[PDB]
Amino acid sequence: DYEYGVLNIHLTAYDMSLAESYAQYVHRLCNRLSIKVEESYAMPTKTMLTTHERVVQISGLSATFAEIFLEVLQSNLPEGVRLSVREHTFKARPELEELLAKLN
Amino acid sequence: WRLSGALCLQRPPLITKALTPLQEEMAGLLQQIEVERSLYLAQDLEDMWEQAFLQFRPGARETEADKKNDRTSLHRKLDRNLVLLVREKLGDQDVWMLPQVEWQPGETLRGTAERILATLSENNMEAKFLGNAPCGHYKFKFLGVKVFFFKALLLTGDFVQAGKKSRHVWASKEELGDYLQPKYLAQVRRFLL
Amino acid sequence: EHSPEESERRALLLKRWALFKQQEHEMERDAIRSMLEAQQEALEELKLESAELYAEAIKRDTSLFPFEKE
Amino acid sequence: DCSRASLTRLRRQAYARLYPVLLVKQDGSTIHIRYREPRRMLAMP
RNA sequence: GUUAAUGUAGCUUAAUACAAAGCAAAGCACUGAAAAUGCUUAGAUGGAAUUGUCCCAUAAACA
């Protein structure tokens, strides 16, 4: 019994618009699947032509869940979209006051 | 107890299916609105580029047109996944079976699962395992017996001698019921994609 | 400017598409449900047969990821 | 299925109209893309 | 054949009344995504008792 680490997916596609559709589409599927998405950040253009790469954060997975989920990505993965799987690497006033008591 | 293991291999579809007509009309609709909301001899160039498309042929979405009968070939289907399927004969049964092998406690399911990949294919085919969790289990009694159905994906296939004397048949979904009648073998669709 | 019948026809095909998409979700969810049920069913059966194998199986593979799929 | 998210549309307020072109790959495969000019196809080198 | 059956729409032990209900789910619009919000979508009591078991349709295993 072990829990997978939070793994980012770098979605690299020629067109951002197609990349955006898949990123949102996987997100909504992720939300239905109870996959938490902390961030959906986008990398800078690969200027030389250009290409667009978008990160959809995926946090939490199970061995059975991963096997079924990863395959579903294959079918969902649309025309000329390249997947990627990688392991992952200012607090406001109300938070500050609570922490002060803890460390005092 | 009679320990027997088996593997439900999966082959990715290389080329995507074409869009349905209902999608095609929707594509026109989204394109039309896109032009509306967008912010605002070339014919010879179009002719040069259109023939450039013609001269270089694209990979056929289905490589079946030439074959029409190559069940034993790894490229049975392209738009959908394939499953290895080999005839087997038992002492008390003679049925078309998913590739089966004998396993021992010394070998883990993955070790047997790896052996299934190359034992009944006697080639350098390349497949990948995602997890050790199995996908099916079916028991037939005459004496205790059990068959474990695993799952794997075919990265690439170096299937030399496509015309083997063995009866290996690649089926996506149509031939599963045709070849595997009993639920113990006709229910393989439950964990098949 | 588009005619009202043209909008009506485009709305109707959109209505068909919305109904078609609803059928897609039912088909995809049922397809996923069968896949999950089969995977869950496989979990139940072998655990009865031998829980020891699953104890090893439930352990993750550190080298499995990063995994790239086209 | 690849057709689940194949039908997509631009999500930008203001921009010059984009035209569809085919990017012919080195293995012959083709993919639809949106390009600034009304070209017909592209060739991967 | 015996089990086990599964039997208002994804869900509900909503309902049988003066309605076959509520919720989940879906499309479009709204530009980070998601959510929210507005305008839209598609539906079922197998069918009883009697409720807070048949009953045959169906039904693997028993057989």
UniProtKB/Swiss-Prot annotation, chain A:
Superkingdom of source: Eukaryota
The record's subcellular locations are: Mitochondrion
N6-succinyllysine PTM positions read 91
Whom does it interact with, and what assembly results? Component of the mitochondrial ribosome large subunit (39S) which comprises a 16S rRNA and about 50 distinct proteins. Interacts with OXA1L.
What family is this? Answer: Belongs to the mitochondrion-specific ribosomal protein mL48 family.
Q: What is this protein called?
A: Large ribosomal subunit protein mL48
Q: What is the lineage of its organism?
A: Eukaryota, Metazoa, Chordata, Craniata, Vertebrata
Swiss-Prot record, chain B:
- What broad class describes the main subcellular location of this protein? mitochondrion
List localization entries.
Answer: Mitochondrion
Q: Which residues carry this modification: N6-acetyllysine?
A: 146
Keyword line? Acetylation, Mitochondrion, Ribonucleoprotein, Ribosomal protein, Transit peptide
Mind listing the GO molecular function terms for this protein? structural constituent of ribosome
What biological processes does GO assign it? mitochondrial translation
Q: What does UniProt give as GO cellular component?
A: cell junction; cytosol; mitochondrial inner membrane; mitochondrial large ribosomal subunit; mitochondrion; nucleoplasm
Q: Which residues carry this modification: N6-succinyllysine?
A: 164
Q: Which family does it belong to?
A: Belongs to the mitochondrion-specific ribosomal protein mL46 family.
Q: Relate the assembly described in the record.
A: Component of the mitochondrial ribosome large subunit (39S) which comprises a 16S rRNA and about 50 distinct proteins.
Protein name, UniProt field = Large ribosomal subunit protein mL46
| Included stretch of the parent chain | 43 to 275 of 283
Curated annotation (Swiss-Prot), chain C:
User: Which residues, if any, are the signal sequence?
Assistant: none
How does this chain assemble? Component of the mitochondrial ribosome large subunit (39S) which comprises a 16S rRNA and about 50 distinct proteins.
What subcellular compartments does it reside in? Mitochondrion
Q: What does UniProt note about where in the body, tissue by tissue, this protein is expressed?
A: Ubiquitous.
What is the name of the protein in this document?
Answer: Large ribosomal subunit protein mL40
Q: Hey, which family's this protein in?
A: Belongs to the mitochondrion-specific ribosomal protein mL40 family.
Transmembrane portions of the chain: none
The source's superkingdom equals Eukaryota
From Swiss-Prot, chain D:
Question: Which processes are annotated in GO (biological process)?
Answer: mitochondrial translation; translation
Q: Which compartments is it annotated to reside in?
A: Mitochondrion
TM ranges? none
What GO CC terms are in its UniProt record?
A: mitochondrial inner membrane; mitochondrial large ribosomal subunit; mitochondrion
Query: Which UniProt keyword terms apply here?
Result: Mitochondrion, Phosphoprotein, Ribonucleoprotein, Ribosomal protein, Transit peptide
- Output the Gene Ontology terms for molecular function: structural constituent of ribosome
Q: In terms of domain of life, where is this protein from?
A: Eukaryota
Subunit structure, interactors included: Component of the mitochondrial ribosome large subunit (39S) which comprises a 16S rRNA and about 50 distinct proteins.
Record family assignment = Belongs to the mitochondrion-specific ribosomal protein mL55 family.
Q: What is this protein called?
A: Large ribosomal subunit protein mL55
Which species expresses this protein natively? Answer: Mus musculus
Q: Which residues of the full protein are shown?
A: 33 to 77 of 127
